[PDB]
Amino acid sequence: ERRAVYIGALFPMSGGWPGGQACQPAVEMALEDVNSRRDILPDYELKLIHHDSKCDPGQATKYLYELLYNDPIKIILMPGCSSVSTLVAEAARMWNLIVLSYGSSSPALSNRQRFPTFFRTHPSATLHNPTRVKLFEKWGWKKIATIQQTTEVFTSTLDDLEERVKEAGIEITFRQSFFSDPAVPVKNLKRQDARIIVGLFYETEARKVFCEVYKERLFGKKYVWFLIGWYADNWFKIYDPSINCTVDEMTEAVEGHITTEIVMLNPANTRSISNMTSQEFVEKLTKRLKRHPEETGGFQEAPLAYDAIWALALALNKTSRLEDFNYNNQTITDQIYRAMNSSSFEGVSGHVVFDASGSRMAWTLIEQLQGGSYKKIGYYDSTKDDLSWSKTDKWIGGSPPADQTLVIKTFRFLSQKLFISVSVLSSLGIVLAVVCLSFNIYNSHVRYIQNSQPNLNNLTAVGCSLALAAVFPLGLDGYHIGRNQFPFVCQARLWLLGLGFSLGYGSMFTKIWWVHTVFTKKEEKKEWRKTLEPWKLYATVGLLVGMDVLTLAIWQIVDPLHRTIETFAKEEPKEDIDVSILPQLEHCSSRKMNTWLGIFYGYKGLLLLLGIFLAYETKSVSTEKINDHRAVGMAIYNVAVLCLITAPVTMILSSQQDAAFAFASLAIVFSSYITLVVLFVPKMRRLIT
Amino acid sequence: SPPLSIMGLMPLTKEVAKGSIGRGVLPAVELAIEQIRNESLLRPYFLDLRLYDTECDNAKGLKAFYDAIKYGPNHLMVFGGVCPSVTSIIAESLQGWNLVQLSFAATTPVLADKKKYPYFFRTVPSDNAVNPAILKLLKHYQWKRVGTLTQDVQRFSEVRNDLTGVLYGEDIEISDTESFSNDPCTSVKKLKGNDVRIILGQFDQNMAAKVFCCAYEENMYGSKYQWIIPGWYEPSWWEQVHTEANSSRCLRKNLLAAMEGYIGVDFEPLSSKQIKTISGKTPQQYEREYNNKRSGVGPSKFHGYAYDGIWVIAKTLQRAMETLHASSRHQRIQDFNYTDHTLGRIILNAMNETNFFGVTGQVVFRNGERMGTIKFTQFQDSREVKVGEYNAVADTLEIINDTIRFQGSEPPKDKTIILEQLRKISLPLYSILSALTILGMIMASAFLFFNIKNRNQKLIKMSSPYMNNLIILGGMLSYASIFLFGLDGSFVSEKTFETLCTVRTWILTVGYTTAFGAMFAKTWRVHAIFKNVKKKIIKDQKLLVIVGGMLLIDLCILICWQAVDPLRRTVEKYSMEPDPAGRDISIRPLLEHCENTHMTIWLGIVYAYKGLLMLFGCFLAWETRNVSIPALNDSKYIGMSVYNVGIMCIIGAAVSFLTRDQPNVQFCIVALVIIFCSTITLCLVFVPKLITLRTN
Ligand SMILES: *[C@@H]1O[C@H](CO)[C@@H](O[C@@H]2O[C@H](CO)[C@@H](O[C@@H]3O[C@H](CO)[C@@H](O)[C@H](O)[C@@H]3O)[C@H](O)[C@H]2NC(C)=O)[C@H](O)[C@H]1NC(C)=O
Ligand SMILES: *[C@@H]1O[C@H](CO)[C@@H](O[C@@H]2O[C@H](CO)[C@@H](O)[C@H](O)[C@H]2NC(C)=O)[C@H](O)[C@H]1NC(C)=O
Ligand SMILES: *[C@@H]1O[C@H](CO)[C@@H](O[C@@H]2O[C@H](CO)[C@@H](O)[C@H](O)[C@H]2NC(C)=O)[C@H](O)[C@H]1NC(C)=O
Ligand SMILES: CSc1nc(NC2CCCC2)c([N+](=O)[O-])c(NC2CCCC2)n1
Ligand SMILES: *[C@@H]1O[C@H](CO)[C@@H](O)[C@H](O)[C@H]1NC(C)=O
Ligand SMILES: *[C@@H]1O[C@H](CO)[C@@H](O)[C@H](O)[C@H]1NC(C)=O
Ligand SMILES: *[C@@H]1O[C@H](CO)[C@@H](O)[C@H](O)[C@H]1NC(C)=O
Ligand SMILES: *[C@@H]1O[C@H](CO)[C@@H](O)[C@H](O)[C@H]1NC(C)=O
Ligand SMILES: *[C@@H]1O[C@H](CO)[C@@H](O)[C@H](O)[C@H]1NC(C)=O
Ligand SMILES: *[C@@H]1O[C@H](CO)[C@@H](O)[C@H](O)[C@H]1NC(C)=O
Ligand SMILES: CP(=O)(O)CCCN
């Protein structure tokens, strides 16, 4: 007859993690196998003393006092969830016992200084952090926020995550915590408006936080939730009297969150240490149960409990005098510890290394919730960074959301309506200018031959034509050309502006100068300032325009105009898209303009006022001339008043969408039209007459 | 008499860090038992106290608890527990044996949830008795904008979660909420950028040095801020934060001047007033007996809060034992195998009510917690001083004046002041333009003098005396418009602004109409006299009648608008608030207007009718240009005038309609547009006849 020994066990069957409903039969499938094979235990049987606990520390403490002070002497203890496992492991040092857990996943249970006689088969919970960080780099985010329940099982995991997220640039922004009532953290998370949320709490707190996240509209299109994976399959479709929400007010609340879990079963087809494959165990266990395998709590953690007996059986067979074990002798406990430390084999979950910092499994599993059903997106591997994606995720609009951003927008203007009208109005006149020039050339001048020489009139005609042909460099912008050759666009503008005004204005001003100075002066004029030849007017025109050439060439080679961006106020509504518009407008300017433009405009304006004074002081005296001085006086008056009114306006208005272009274009076109028609209607009149 | 015994757990040895606390409170309770034993309120029984050891160890504590349960007599209550872990471990599992716990040193805030700690009472104000008191302090200084800065642990998050529920209902709002874990002054910059001025902090002793070092670099001190920091730290906690100089980025003398005058909130060890309490001595008497009772053991700060727990237990036992039943109530006190639920209920419900004046005031409970007393301290001259008090059952706040002070000369403010300001016209500009308009008025007076003086001298064209007088009166009537434009809200006081804006258009349009009509009537008369001919006067006042009809119809055009359709002020603002010249009062600009909801209309009709008048004048100039009449008629001056007026008006209207955000340039534009046009018109009209009459 074989002697019998006893072990102690706590099986949680309710509460934050109901596991015993799938864990109590599995051990009952193992013990009947370990007490029936004469190879592994020749003269001993193992018996179990189980107690329900709900893994609450009060009932756990009561049942622990009940267990430790009874007549059958125990050998090992087997706790349940982590809140009981840590308490048992801390307290078992005064009785010289051995704690062997099968469901605890606390990262803080690796510190061997506080827990000397503790062993576990469940892997560490730091295996989720190499996955989630990867999922933060594929979709490109940098600002997240966490919310946790203040138990050390989640506190150590949050510490490990915030330690391992620093090596990828991502940084935490907002932290929250709660002990029993999560209303205030959810309120603060809504008022602070975070977008990426990571949750760390038990199963029973998930409903008591989601019924309070539904009442503040913290879901929908621009919020992402990361959760845990070992929950039940239908954890929101159950009746809970401690909340006020209804099932259709939560099914729309939990739509679109991301869950990650760890696999716990060898997917291959091998032969184990117990002559059983990796799916016959699952089939036999599902036959042994009574309810459906989809809703039985803790179904994934069954092979761990099936291996936790076999490992101790092999260790105790390696030791193989187990009838006088007291509660105050050390010399047996260190022997059993050294025999257990050097054990390794293959079981149902794989190879049991049994002494590391965890991490004897490799893979993970990622899932999403769609329409009230779970779907597996894709697996992951930790070492070789393998990520076997499958493209089975449906966001809103075919694209995942992001954080808040800001777009940059340059201005344009009416590139068709206001611009093509100016272009056709310029093209209507640029050809009339040259055909009137041709008419001045080829027509047999008789009255004009009696009048002044028409070369200084061809100068005026070419000048107003070249002044009119300067709207095309003014309307173009970054819509077409303004990327690289913008300085040549400014060059075209400035060269055309500097030429086309100066040539025609000088060719009129010298005629009005002579027609003033010839008539009534007898002091000193005979062959003065020039010769008689048309080279007189040509040379004074050349001096006047050469001045302008020096003015352009000094600050075109000393201080050119490259480019300048101006940025003002922002936050357009942007048509209900989560984006913020920033408008700017670019234009061609140097570092200094209000000095050069001012001095050049004043130097030209004094000459313009002198010209209109010299044009007014002679009105109705004429000899040997047909119609020149009256016509050039009227034209110079019109050009003078139009330029003096228009030019100081375009410097003030910087909003050049429809003001600064329109004023300059209207002034140029009207001045050119009036000058041409008034100067060269009477030649055609007296030629047809 | 048969005895009844109660369990007690506290550190005793010297090899632990919290043993002296027990040795600080063991003589005091050693007095209180004697105070019972000489009177014996529990007359047929006798009180007994058993003592055990915890040593602030989970394993040793649970072993001692289990050994006291297994090898001990029948116990009734458990009294004690000072270490913040073994106390919670014991208290979470009291329903299994039906016992009641009374603590005197567990001040952790998590023990207030009575949904899983039903059998736990304490006689010491916890860390949740700070949240009401702070609120009352705000009602002594009127601060309604606060920001919180907390660590992230359990005990430092329970207070921040309770603060929201405390400060709900009143008119106080939490502006910011930040939280750090290891680097405190990454969120201090966020608090600086949000511009808060009252700070409530919750952090331990280690992070306080880092917070006060990082707050000195960002310049968040002086007479502009106020810090509320917990004050249960040990004395001289700053002189030993750095053994070596390994606390750089902040020096000593640039830290003592950084943490100046913060407010520390704690509880109070004893009572300030004096009556005869339930024992029979004054609190000063009891303090004397405790101070000469111990021999050489140093004093503690829990020796007062433990002397009252024994009397609480004694009064509870006396008020629960002597119920209506006698025989069963004296028989059921030795069969207590820690399973009797009725005895546990009859102990708990009698323990719920207690009310007497002990040594720390009244001893009253609320949902398990205790109503106590709160003490305020301030950091002054590198030292801490007690400055106030806050009762809890009477809900009053007493401030000991002649002690508190501030760095400035008044309490600081919660936020800066927002000041709205109007944008006015430059007074030199107004003076210059008014002087120029006055000079133009004097020139117009001279011109009218000339027109009336030689009206019948040398036959100067013998045409339009009255019409020229009407033209120059129209110009004089138009100058009052530019007299009238440059108003300001400070000079109208909202008294006549709703009327001047709608009579400005009246006077301007009347002047315009009468000027152009009296201009065109002359040329109409010259065209009338040279047709349908022997000539004479054709009309003495019929032309005056028809220009009056034109002015009347275009004035009724205006007047038939102000019967249902208004046009009044809509003052707008531009919140781009800068600083003043060195000051801190944030000012915003706002400017007034005189607009309507139909500003794009009521302009095209009047502009089109003025264009029709211009076209009629063009017809008159056409009819008079082909005459080549002597100086009595004029067809060139009128054309020059209309060409110089129309272009300038059609430019100036569109220019002045655009520049709305620059109120000091559109006045200068409209003034020049009016004055140049009127001067050019008067000069083209009068002086050609004037030079001819002067030549004669
Ligand atoms: C546990 O291990 C045993 C042996 O390794 C497996 O035993 C099964 O045994 C039967 C009975 O012999 C085999 O069937 C037939 O055996 C006769 C013997 O005369 C032979 O002539 C036939 O060709 C046939 O092999 C059966 O093959 C064998 N099973 C397997 C998978 O080979 C038993 O299956 C193992 N348990 C489990 C759950 O797999
Ligand atoms: C359990 O331990 C026993 C020893 O107590 C092992 O039995 C031995 O098996 C080998 C096989 O070659 C024999 O040579 C020995 O004589 C056996 N020992 C005894 C005492 O009979 C047994 O193999 C172990 N079971 C395992 C490792 O599964
Ligand atoms: C604990 O005792 C207090 C003090 O009596 C109870 O508070 C009131 O008690 C009186 C009678 O003792 C009742 O009439 C009142 O209704 C109680 N409430 C209030 C708000 O005055 C308190 O109810 C007791 N606790 C329990 C659980 O009964
Ligand atoms: C040189 S002939 C002359 N033509 C004038 N207009 C013409 C009609 C169309 C543009 C030309 C004016 N005008 O419109 O004022 C004018 N004014 C003088 C009198 C005061 C000094 C200037 N002289
Ligand atoms: C512990 O057990 C060993 C072997 O059984 C024995 O030698 C030793 O004396 C024991 N220690 C005790 C009884 O304290
Ligand atoms: C357990 O075995 C490993 C394997 O070498 C060894 O490194 C470790 O020190 C052992 N544990 C103890 C407590 O000696
Ligand atoms: C008890 O009280 C009596 C008088 O009431 C007094 O004489 C005696 O000294 C007291 N004894 C103690 C131990 O307090
Ligand atoms: C020097 O500073 C570090 C922290 O920067 C501290 O941990 C260490 O104890 C200091 N050393 C001494 C001797 O003070
Ligand atoms: C338990 O209580 C009963 C009376 O209810 C008593 O007779 C018995 O002695 C108690 N048990 C112990 C171990 O004292
Ligand atoms: C505190 O100030 C008030 C008035 O400011 C004064 O009446 C009062 O006496 C002061 N307190 C003390 C203790 O002097
Ligand atoms: C949160 P816990 O580790 O106690 C239970 C984990 C079960 N896989």
Contact indicator for B199, B165 with CB cutoff of 8 Å: no
Of B201, B199, B215, B203, whose CA–CA distance to B249 is shortest?
B215
Residues of chain B contacting residue A327, judged by C-beta atoms under 8 Å apart: none
Distance (Å, whole) CA B413 – CA B406? 12
- CA B458 to the chain's CA centroid: 82
Of B29, B156, B164, whose CA–CA distance to B105 is shortest?
B29
Bridge-based pairing of strands A143-149 and A171-174 is: parallel
State the nearest Cα–Cα gap between A598 and chain B, in angstroms. Answer: 18
Distance (Å, whole) CA B384 – CA B377? 6
Element holding B202 (H helix, E strand): strand B198-202
Contact indicator for B365, B374 with CB cutoff of 8 Å: no
Of A507, A393, A411, A400, whose CA–CA distance to A460 is shortest?
A507
Token duo for residue B221: 């001190």
Distance (Å, whole) CA B336 – CA B339? 7
Cβ neighbours for B493, distance < 8 A, ≥ 6 positions apart: none
Q: Tell me, letter by letter, the H, E, C secondary structure of A486-547.
A: HHHHHHHHHHHHHHHHHHHHHHHHHHHHHHHHCCCCCCCCCCCCCCCCCHHHHHHHHHHHHH
Distances (CA, A) of B160 to A186, B128, B165, B229, B231: 14, 10, 9, 13, 16
Distance (Å, whole) CA A21 – CA B420? 71
Of B243, B250, B244, B168, whose CA–CA distance to B214 is shortest?
B250
Q: What is the DSSP letter of B367?
A: T
Residues of chain B contacting residue A180, judged by C-beta atoms under 8 Å apart: 113, 115
Touching B: A residues 34-93, CB under 8 Å: 57-59, 61-62, 65, 68-69, 87, 90-91, 93
Task: Write the DSSP string, B398-465.
Answer: EE-TTT---SSSS---SSPPEEEEEPPPPHHHHHHHHHHHHHHHHHHHHHHHHHHHTTTSTT-TT--H
Bridge-based pairing of strands B120-122 and A224-228 is: unpaired
3 state DSSP class of A225: strand
Distance (Å, whole) CA B443 – CA B440? 5
Domain that holds residue B253: 130-267
Instruction: For residue B353, report the phi and psi dihedrals to the nearest 5 degrees.
Output: -100, 130
Distance (Å, whole) CA B437 – CA B482? 8
Distance (Å, whole) CA A631 – CA B469? 35
Q: What angle do CA A668, A671, A676 make, to 5 degrees?
A: 120
Distance (Å, whole) CA B499 – CA B569? 11
Q: Do A659 and B66 touch (CB under 8 A)?
A: no
Place of tokens 């602004």: B497
Tally of helices (H runs) and strands (E runs) in chain B: 20, 18
Q: Tell me, letter by letter, the H, E, C secondary structure of A615-644.
A: HHCCCCCCCCCCCHHHHHHHHHHHHHHHHH
Distance (Å, whole) CA A362 – CA A372? 29
A8 strand-pairing partners: A49, A77
Distance (Å, whole) CA B514 – CA B550? 8
Q: What angle do CA B463, B466, B469 make, to 5 degrees?
A: 110
Distance (Å, whole) CA A510 – CA A517? 10
Contact indicator for B374, B390 with CB cutoff of 8 Å: yes
Of A258, A255, A253, whose CA–CA distance to A214 is shortest?
A253
Place of tokens 């949000």: B194
Of A306, A274, A315, A307, whose CA–CA distance to A98 is shortest?
A315
How many CA atoms does the CB half-sphere of B52 hold within 13 Å? 23
Dmax of chain A from CA atoms? 157
State the nearest Cα–Cα gap between B152 and chain A, in angstroms. Answer: 8
- Is any ligand 9 atom within 6 A of the Cβ of residue B337? yes
The enclosing domain of B195 has a CATH number of 3.40.50.2300
**Ligand 1 pocket test target in A275, A276, A280, A287 with most atoms within 8 Å of CB:** A275
Distance (Å, whole) CA B620 – CA B124? 106
Q: What angle do CA B427, B431, B436 make, to 5 degrees?
A: 150
Fold of domain A128-263+399-406: Rossmann fold (3.40.50)
Would you give the end-to-end CA distance of chain A in angstroms? 150
Position in ligand 9 atom list of the atom nearest CA B336: 2
- CA A435 to the chain's CA centroid: 61
| Gap from CA of B236 to ligand 8 centroid (Å) | 20
State the nearest Cα–Cα gap between B635 and chain A, in angstroms. Answer: 17
* Residues belonging to chain B: 696
Q: Using N-to-C axis directions, what is the helix angle for B497-529 and B465-485, rounded to 10°?
A: 160
Contact indicator for B140, B399 with CB cutoff of 8 Å: yes
Token duo for residue A150: 């203040």
The protein residue with its alpha carbon nearest to ligand 5, atom 13, reads A329
Instruction: State the amino acid at position B471 in one-letter form.
Output: I
Q: What is the DSSP letter of B251?
A: -
Bridge-based pairing of strands B120-122 and B101-103 is: parallel
Token duo for residue B324: 């209506």
Q: Is B646 exposed, middle or buried (0-12, 13-18, 19+ CB in 10 A)?
A: middle
Q: Do A58 and B96 touch (CB under 8 A)?
A: yes
Distance (Å, whole) CA A653 – CA A657? 10
Distance (Å, whole) CA A194 – CA A210? 16
Of B129, B131, B136, B126, whose CA–CA distance to B148 is shortest?
B131
Q: Do B58 and A185 touch (CB under 8 A)?
A: no
Q: Is A69 exposed, middle or buried (0-12, 13-18, 19+ CB in 10 A)?
A: exposed
3 state DSSP class of A664: helix
CB atoms within 10 A of CB B250: 17
Cβ neighbours for A542, distance < 8 A, ≥ 6 positions apart: none
CB atoms within 10 A of CB A521: 9
Token duo for residue B602: 């009521």
Q: Is A242 on the interface with B (CB under 8 A)?
A: no
Could you give the strand order of the β-sheet that contains B384-391, starting from the edge strand earlier in sequence? B174-179, B146-150, B198-202, B226-230, B263-267, B373-379, B384-391, B397-399
Contact indicator for B147, B191 with CB cutoff of 8 Å: yes
Distance (Å, whole) CA A55 – CA A18? 9
What burial letters (b/e) apply to A287-318, b meaning 16+ CB within 10 Å?
A: eeeeeeeeebbbbbbbbbbbbbbbbbbbbbee
Contact indicator for B160, A183 with CB cutoff of 8 Å: no
Q: What is the DSSP letter of B186?
A: G
Contact indicator for B373, B379 with CB cutoff of 8 Å: no
CB atoms within 10 A of CB B562: 11
Of A496, A432, A424, whose CA–CA distance to A672 is shortest?
A432
Alpha-carbon Rg for chain A in angstroms: 47
Distance (Å, whole) CA B295 – CA B354? 34
Distance (Å, whole) CA A540 – CA A265? 102
Distance (Å, whole) CA A319 – CA A333? 11
| Torsion sign, CA atoms B409, B411, B416, B422 | negative
Contact indicator for A474, A661 with CB cutoff of 8 Å: yes
Of B445, B438, B455, B441, whose CA–CA distance to B690 is shortest?
B455
Distance (Å, whole) CA A252 – CA B82? 48
Task: Write the DSSP string, B260-296.
Answer: -S-EEEEE-SS-SS----SSSS-HHHHHHHHHHHSSS
Contact indicator for B108, B92 with CB cutoff of 8 Å: no
Q: What is the DSSP letter of A296?
A: S
Contact indicator for B109, B163 with CB cutoff of 8 Å: no
Instruction: For residue B454, report the phi and psi dihedrals to the nearest 5 degrees.
Output: -100, 40
Q: Do A175 and B179 touch (CB under 8 A)?
A: yes
- CA B476 to the chain's CA centroid: 55
Residues of chain A contacting residue B95, judged by C-beta atoms under 8 Å apart: 58
Distance (Å, whole) CA A103 – CA A305? 8
Can you point out the beta strands (E) in A360-448?
364-370, 373-380, 407-410
Gap positions in chain A, given as the residue before each gap (C–N > 2.5 A)?
320
| Gap from CA of B6 to ligand 9 centroid (Å) | 19
Contact indicator for B590, B562 with CB cutoff of 8 Å: no
- CA B647 to the chain's CA centroid: 54
Contact indicator for A147, A200 with CB cutoff of 8 Å: yes
Of B153, B265, B267, B149, whose CA–CA distance to B210 is shortest?
B149
Q: Do B658 and A653 touch (CB under 8 A)?
A: yes
State the nearest Cα–Cα gap between A432 and chain B, in angstroms. Answer: 25
Alpha-carbon Rg for chain B in angstroms: 48
Residues of chain A contacting residue B96, judged by C-beta atoms under 8 Å apart: 58-59, 61-62
Distance (Å, whole) CA A503 – CA A515? 19
| Gap from CA of A332 to ligand 5 centroid (Å) | 8
Distance (Å, whole) CA A236 – CA A254? 9
Q: Tell me, letter by letter, the H, E, C secondary structure of B589-654.
A: EEECCCCCCCCCCCCHHHHHHHHHHHHHHHHHHHHHHCCCCCCCCCCCHHHHHHHHHHHHHHHHHH
Would you give the end-to-end CA distance of chain B in angstroms? 150
Instruction: For residue B369, report the phi and psi dihedrals to the nearest 5 degrees.
Output: -80, 175
Which of B182, B651, B669 is best to mutate for the A interface (most A CBs within 10 A)?
B651
CB atoms within 10 A of CB A154: 22
Instruction: State the amino acid at position A489 in one-letter form.
Output: V
CB atoms within 10 A of CB A329: 10
What burial letters (b/e) apply to A561-572, b meaning 16+ CB within 10 Å?
A: beeeeeeeeeee
- Is any ligand 11 atom within 6 A of the Cβ of residue A153? yes
Distance (Å, whole) CA A556 – CA A237? 78
Q: Do A93 and B59 touch (CB under 8 A)?
A: yes
A584 strand-pairing partners: A410, A567
Q: Do B95 and A57 touch (CB under 8 A)?
A: no
* Residues belonging to chain A: 689
Instruction: For residue B500, report the phi and psi dihedrals to the nearest 5 degrees.
Output: -65, -35
